């Protein structure tokens, strides 16, 4: 009967499709690893997918996945148990070392480019025409930590030019330098900017950017990692 | 085993209950207190379903069906074989679902991410509880709830729906459907778009999000943007489930007739109600 | 409380993006529209520009002729009375020809002929638009995933309106043009074919419809939850994985024992949705042509 043939056929197709989908979703992070870093004997029922190449725009090279994987950065963690399945504990300052919820990934130390190859994220002072169109303008407002103390004042907004959204607030500290605070980690209010994640005295530990008019992907990761990491590691304060 | 990049994230912390006592993983799975709770609740209900299938006399999953108490039982407990098994499986399901949510929250805290996923899953739970708890209670009996069986719950949807004529005419069912349809539309497009940018034509460099935006603008005169589309998908799916829950919570409690009759508020309105012609004149 | 990134705190506005050029023919691209602050709280404020080429104008023309045909028929059922038109807007129906006419195009205007005309115009409008989703992607150098996914929606519509009615020997089997009448047609269709719940292709279709809401809730929430690490910038996370992509993946690995990648979640997504209408189309195609009664069929096979 043709309907029975069709339903049975479709179920075969669907198993084929699920197999395809799971292997496509093994292009990052595989092969699996023992907690000591060596390859795990158990890699699952699905095989590693055959590698694929992306050609990055603007002469930025090519990425092949899956491929030779490393975190090219030291991980300041130690094993908590002989056997597998237990937490690995920070050996140092987890926030300054980039571990747990403070983690960052060794992305390219270059800025994301828009379609025409200009920097995607620029401070508003370097971005002709850009202004606050609605909601409270945060420039000039004080910045306040979870300890309720002032960390600095907002001197600019860093904007995703192509998407026209505020991504960071640039914040001047008492010492005169500045840092970037992710927009999604601040609550802008009528008389101040609150930052639940960090005490005032931890804003300086926010990683600093090499150039004052651009930010690399590597820097963004360190900044967002450090700042999210305070929800857990600055919490006792 | 671990993903190649996972180790640096498997630190202690983020539990809500039990401190470090349950702060470990089994294989890929994070445990926590709510993982042991999930396991306990799920184990008991699975077992209780097994008992229910021995009583009914079958092992075929297509046949197994655990019915709620008959309506005559109101909101009292019932004997195991005559509805009580369903009531305890329903308690277990709710505990397991809620514990899964709270476990999700613990994982959120350890990974230092927002709580949007369990918040969202909670709408699914509120839909289950609507059909299983809120609506049955408002109507006065657990027997108004749905049976736990693969095909018998379908028969329940059919019977419940046909009690009010064509359930298509439920106004909140309509809104709900539009959200479901619009969500599938949206997901197909978002998957397509991202994938069409990352996997461009042969002989071409990976596209940028500016191409994504340009594509939607060319096609439709508006791009909602990367943040926006994920905002939108979450809103469409969530709104679909809210209006599903709403369209049932008002059925049998504040509405009792065939749902097509609701639409006289527009038709039989006194001024044009009597004008000759049209469909209703 | 923290803040959730559902609505924007501060909107930011700059020079309008005119878009990528690539091989897009700029002559067919319009001027930029106005900015909507209302929209800018939830997504981008920019309206326009929009591209209209040979095929888009054709699509819009056939689509307006479709709406105008249904419209003129609706006014006729209303006796040219504006009061009646508004009150029975949803009850009006432009029905296909009766079964007596088979697949003939020789039905009188007021007994199915106009339905056939409306259908012609809708057919040109949808296929014109499909060719257009392809062409807009081609001109930008993008893959054709959008047009391929859209074929899946088109296939359900093609079966309901055209392939199935033809296979059954009469236009009377197609869907009428009305709000309520199409609902009634859908209920009558399940009743006549012996409960569509028991069509395993309806059940799969529902699995993927529900599953499409499951997966977009899961993915929408996920990406917003990692937006503090720039996770919504999905394309750059695919080219150079960030802690956003890693945390998202680990959330799910630790929750359900497996996970996706930034790229692969969008394949799960495109297939979850596409399958809705692909399966559903098979189930309708098979109804009446092959299986008269789904419940009955289901108890034997
Ligand atoms: C799938 C099975 C049925 C069917 C069952 C339903 C049901 C059930 C409902 C709809 C509803 C709608 N249907 Mg229908 N609908 C069908 C075929 C169609 C066809 C077609 C054949 O091309 C069209 C154009 C529509 C169009 C519509 C909309 C007017 C309305 C909201 C849907 C939506 O949000 O879209 C996506 C949104 C965009 C913005 C695009 N339906 C088939 C025949 N349709 C809902 C409604 O409100 O009816 C009054 C509703 O509850
Ligand atoms: C003949 C039948 C009637 C009818 C009668 C009903 C009735 C009765 C109901 C619906 C409801 C719905 N109908 Mg209707 N419906 C009809 C025709 C249609 C049509 C159409 C094209 O004709 C459409 C699109 C719909 C669409 C819908 C949805 C809007 C809604 C179901 C979604 C939902 O509630 O999810 C919500 C999701 C859940 C409840 C899932 C909960 C999941 C839980 C939390 C997790 C489970 C975990 C699991 C156990 C673990 C597995 C373990 C492992 C992984 C192994 N109906 C016809 C006209 N319809 C229902 C509704 O709105 O209910 C709220 C409802 O009660
Ligand atoms: C929402 C409105 C109605 C309803 C109306 C319908 C209709 C109509 C249909 C279904 C169908 C299904 N429904 Mg239902 N269903 C309801 C409530 C539920 C509940 C619940 C606890 O709330 C559950 C678990 C299910 C589960 C299911 C699946 C068995 C099946 C495919 C759905 C799917 O993939 O969704 C999306 C989810 C995923 C893709 C994730 C995977 C979920 C898996 C597949 C669920 C397995 C359930 C398992 C057997 C339950 C036992 C667990 C154990 C004892 C360990 N329904 C309510 C009462 N349901 C379809 C079917 O084919 O059934 C015969 C179908 O046509
Ligand atoms: C009593 C009624 C029957 C029933 C009879 C039917 C029938 C009949 C059908 C369905 C179909 C479906 N039903 Mg059912 N269905 C019932 C009960 C349910 C229940 C439930 C009770 O819980 C659920 C969850 C569902 C769920 C579903 C869906 C999975 C499926 C539609 C998928 C879709 O996306 O269509 C929406 C998408 C489309 C129609 C694609 C069309 C896209 C076109 C090309 C766009 C044209 C737009 C046009 C140009 C104008 C607008 C453009 C503007 C400019 C914006 N049904 C009851 C049991 N159901 C359909 C199916 O596939 O069956 C297997 C179908 O034909
Ligand atoms: C609200 C928007 C949509 C949504 C969202 C959503 N669902 C979610 C989530 C989110 C955000 C999760 O984070 C969570 C998840 O982890 O997914 C991978 C989940 C989830 N959604 C799931 C299923 C699901 N969601 C559904 C729907 C939806 N989910 C909505 C449309 C549906 C249906 C029917 O449409 C189903 C079937 C699970 C995969 C998962 C929750 C897993 C879980 O709760 O684990 C703990 C419990 C068990 C492992 C088993 C409990 C066993 C019981 C004790 C016995 C079974 C009783 C049951 C009531 C009988 C059912 C019989 C049926 C035949 C009717
Ligand atoms: C996976 C199947 C889902 C889906 C997918 C889908 N729909 C699509 C597409 C895709 C991939 C497009 O690329 C195309 C589009 O361009 O969207 C903006 C479209 C489209 N889906 C549309 C509507 C639509 N899709 C629907 C359903 C679905 N679309 C499914 C849920 C529905 C219903 C009834 O549920 C409707 C009403 C249009 C907005 C658009 C096709 C535009 C068109 O053909 O216009 C012709 C008419 C005029 C110009 C008159 C004005
Ligand atoms: C960008 O980020 C994202 C990821 O990561 C980068 C992802 O992983 C995912 C997660 C999503 C997927 C991996 C897609 C596949 C998942 C589905 C289709 C949803 C349905 C899921 C299931 C049916 C699996 C259910 C498994 C369970 C409940 C385990 C039960 C075992 C016990 C111990 C009990 C999303 C959403 C995401 O957006
Ligand atoms: C890059 C994100 N752009 C974008 N824009 C839009 N616009 C509408 C209005 C169709 C949702 N959609 C998507 S995916 C649906 N993506
Ligand atoms: Cl065109
Ligand atoms: Fe996405």
UniProtKB/Swiss-Prot annotation, chain A:
GO terms for biological process: photosynthesis, light reaction. It holds the Pfam family PRC. Keywords: Bacteriochlorophyll, Chlorophyll, Chromophore, Electron transport, Membrane, Photosynthesis, Reaction center, Transmembrane, Transmembrane helix, Transport. Residues 22-237 are cytoplasmic. The keyword Membrane applies. It is found in: Cellular chromatophore membrane. The chain crosses the membrane at residues 2-21. NCBIfam families: puhA. The reaction center is a membrane-bound complex that mediates the initial photochemical event in the electron transfer process of photosynthesis. Heterotrimer composed of subunits L, M, and H. This is Reaction center protein H chain. It comes from Cereibacter sphaeroides (Rhodobacter sphaeroides). The lineage of its organism: Bacteria, Pseudomonadati, Pseudomonadota, Alphaproteobacteria, Rhodobacterales.
From Swiss-Prot, chain B:
A ubiquinone binds at residue 216. GO terms for molecular function: bacteriochlorophyll binding; electron transporter, transferring electrons within the cyclic electron transport pathway of photosynthesis activity; metal ion binding. GO terms for cellular component: plasma membrane light-harvesting complex; plasma membrane-derived chromatophore membrane. Fe cation binds at residues 190, 230. GO terms for biological process: photosynthetic electron transport in photosystem II. (7R,8Z)-bacteriochlorophyll b binds at residues 153, 173. The chain crosses the membrane at residues 32-55, 83-111, 116-138, 171-198, 225-250. It is a multi-pass membrane protein. Its main location: membrane. Keywords: Bacteriochlorophyll, Chlorophyll, Chromophore, Electron transport, Iron, Magnesium, Membrane, Metal-binding, Photosynthesis, Reaction center, Transmembrane, Transmembrane helix, Transport. Residues 56-82, 139-170, 251-281 are periplasmic. Reaction center is composed of four bacteriochlorophylls, two bacteriopheophytins, two ubiquinones, one iron, and three highly hydrophobic polypeptide chains (designated L, M, and H). The reaction center is a membrane-bound complex that mediates the initial photochemical event in the electron transfer process of photosynthesis. Belongs to the reaction center PufL/M/PsbA/D family. This is Reaction center protein L chain. The gene is pufL.
Swiss-Prot record, chain C:
CDD domains: Photo-RC_M (cd09291). GO terms for cellular component: plasma membrane light-harvesting complex; plasma membrane-derived chromatophore membrane. Fe cation binds at residues 219, 234, 266. One of its GO terms (molecular function) is metal ion binding. Signal peptide: none annotated. The keyword rRNA-binding does not apply. It is found in: Cellular chromatophore membrane. GO terms for biological process: photosynthetic electron transport in photosystem II. It is a multi-pass membrane protein. Keywords: Bacteriochlorophyll, Chlorophyll, Chromophore, Electron transport, Iron, Magnesium, Membrane, Metal-binding, Photosynthesis, Reaction center, Transmembrane, Transmembrane helix, Transport. The chain crosses the membrane at residues 53-79, 110-139, 142-167, 197-225, 259-285. Its main location: membrane. The keyword Electron transport applies. SUPFAM superfamilies: Bacterial photosystem II reaction centre, L and M subunits. InterPro entries: Photo_II_D1/D2_sf (IPR036854), Photo_RC_L/M (IPR000484), Photo_RC_L/M_CS (IPR055265), Photo_RC_M (IPR005781). A ubiquinone binds at residue 252. (7R,8Z)-bacteriochlorophyll b binds at residues 182, 202. The reaction center is a membrane-bound complex that mediates the initial photochemical event in the electron transfer process of photosynthesis. Reaction center is composed of four bacteriochlorophylls, two bacteriopheophytins, two ubiquinones, one iron, and three highly hydrophobic polypeptide chains (designated L, M, and H). Belongs to the reaction center PufL/M/PsbA/D family. This is Reaction center protein M chain. The gene is pufM.
């Amino acid at each position: 009967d043709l309907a029975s043939l069709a339903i049975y056929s479709f179920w075969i197709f669907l198993a084929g499709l699920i197999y395809y989908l799971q292997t496509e979703n093994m292009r990052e992070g595989y092969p699996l690893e023992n907690e000591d870093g060596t390859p795990a004997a158990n890699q699952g029922p699905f095989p590693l997918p055959k590698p694929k190449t992306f050609i990055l725009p603007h002469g930025r090279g090519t990425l092949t996945v899956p491929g030779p994987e490393s975190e090219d950065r030291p991980i300041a963690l130690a094993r908590t148990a002989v056997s597998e399945g237990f937490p690995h504990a920070p050996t140092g300052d987890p926030m300054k070392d980039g571990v747990g919820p403070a983690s960052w990934v060794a992305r390219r130390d270059l800025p994301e480019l828009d379609g025409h190859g200009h920097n995607k994220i620029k401070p508003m002072k370097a971005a002709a025409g850009f202004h606050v169109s609605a909601g409270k303008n945060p420039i000039g407002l004080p910045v306040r930590g979870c300890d309720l103390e002032i960390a600095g004042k907002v001197v600019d907004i860093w904007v995703d030019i192509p998407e026209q959204m505020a991504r960071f607030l640039e914040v001047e500290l008492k010492d005169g330098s500045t840092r970037l605070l992710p927009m999604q980690m601040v609550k802008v209010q009528s008389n101040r900017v609150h930052v639940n994640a960090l005490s005032s005295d931890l804003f300086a530990g926010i990683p600093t950017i090499k150039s004052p008019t651009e930010v690399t992907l590597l820097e963004e990761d360190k900044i967002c990692g450090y700042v999210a990491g305070g929800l857990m590691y600055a919490a006792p304060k | 085993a671990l993903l190649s990049f996972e180790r640096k994230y498997r630190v202690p912390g983020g539990t809500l209950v039990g401190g470090n006592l349950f702060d470990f993983w089994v294989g890929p799975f994070y445990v926590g207190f709510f993982g042991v709770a999930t396991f306990f609740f799920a184990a008991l209900g699975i077992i209780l379903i097994a008992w229910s299938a021995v009583l009914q006399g079958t092992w075929n999953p297509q046949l197994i069906s655990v019915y709620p108490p008959a309506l005559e039982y109101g909101l009292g407990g019932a004997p195991l074989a005559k509805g009580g098994l369903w009531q305890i499986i329903t308690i277990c399901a709710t505990g397991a679902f809620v514990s899964w949510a709270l476990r999700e929250v613990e994982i959120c805290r350890k990974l230092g991410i927002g709580y949007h996923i369990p918040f969202a899953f909670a709408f699914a739970i509120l839909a289950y509880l609507t059909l299983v708890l809120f609506r049955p209670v408002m109507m006065g009996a657990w027997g108004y709830a749905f049976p736990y069986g693969i095909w018998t719950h379908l028969d329940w949807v059919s019977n419940t729906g046909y009690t009010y004529g064509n359930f298509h005419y439920n106004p909140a069912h309509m809104i709900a459907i539009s959200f479901f349809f619009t969500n599938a539309l949206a997901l197909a497009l978002h998957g397509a778009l991202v994938l069409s940018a990352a996997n461009p034509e042969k002989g071409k460099e990976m596209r940028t999000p500016d191409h994504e935006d340009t594509f939607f603008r060319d096609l439709v005169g508006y791009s909602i943007g990367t943040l926006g589309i994920h905002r939108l998908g979450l809103l469409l799916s969530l709104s679909a489930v809210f209006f599903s829950a709403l369209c049932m919570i008002i059925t049998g409690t504040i509405w009792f007739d065939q749902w097509v009759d609701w639409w006289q508020w527009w038709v039989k309105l006194p001024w044009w109600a009597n004008i000759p012609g049209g469909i209703n004149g | 409380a923290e803040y959730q990134n559902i609505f924007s705190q501060v909107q930011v506005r700059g020079p309008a993006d005119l878009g990528m050029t690539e091989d897009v023919n700029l002559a067919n691209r319009s001027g930029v529209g106005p900015f909507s602050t209302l929209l800018g709280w939830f997504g981008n404020a920019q309206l326009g520009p929009i591209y209209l080429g040979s095929l888009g104008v054709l699509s819009l023309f056939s689509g307006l002729m479709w709406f105008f045909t249904i419209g003129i028929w609706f006014w006729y059922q209303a006796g040219w009375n504006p009061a009646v038109f508004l009150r029975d807007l949803f009850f009006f129906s432009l029905e296909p020809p009766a079964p007596e006419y088979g697949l003939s195009f020789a039905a009188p205007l007021k007994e199915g002929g106009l339905w056939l005309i409306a259908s012609f115009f809708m057919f040109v409008a949808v296929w014109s638009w499909w060719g257009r989703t392809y062409l807009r992607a081609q001109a930008l150098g993008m893959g054709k995933h959008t047009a391929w996914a859209f074929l899946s929606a088109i296939w359900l519509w093609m079966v309901l309106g055209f392939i199935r009615p033809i296979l059954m020997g009469s236009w009377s089997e197609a869907v009428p043009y009305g709000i309520f009448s199409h609902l009634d047609w859908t209920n009558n269709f399940s009743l006549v074919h012996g409960n569509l719940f028991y069509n395993p292709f309806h059940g799969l279709s529902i699995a993927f419809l529900y599953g499409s809401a499951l997966l977009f809730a899961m993915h929408g929430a996920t990406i917003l939850a990692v937006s503090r690490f720039g996770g919504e910038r999905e394309l750059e996370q695919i080219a150079d994985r960030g802690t956003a992509a890693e945390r998202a993946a680990l959330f799910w690995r630790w929750t359900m024992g497996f996970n996706a990648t930034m790229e692969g979640i969008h394949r799960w997504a495109i297939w979850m949705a596409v399958l809705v209408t692909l399966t559903g189309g098979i189930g309708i195609l098979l109804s009446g042509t092959v299986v008269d009664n789904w419940y009955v069929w289901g108890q034997n096979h």
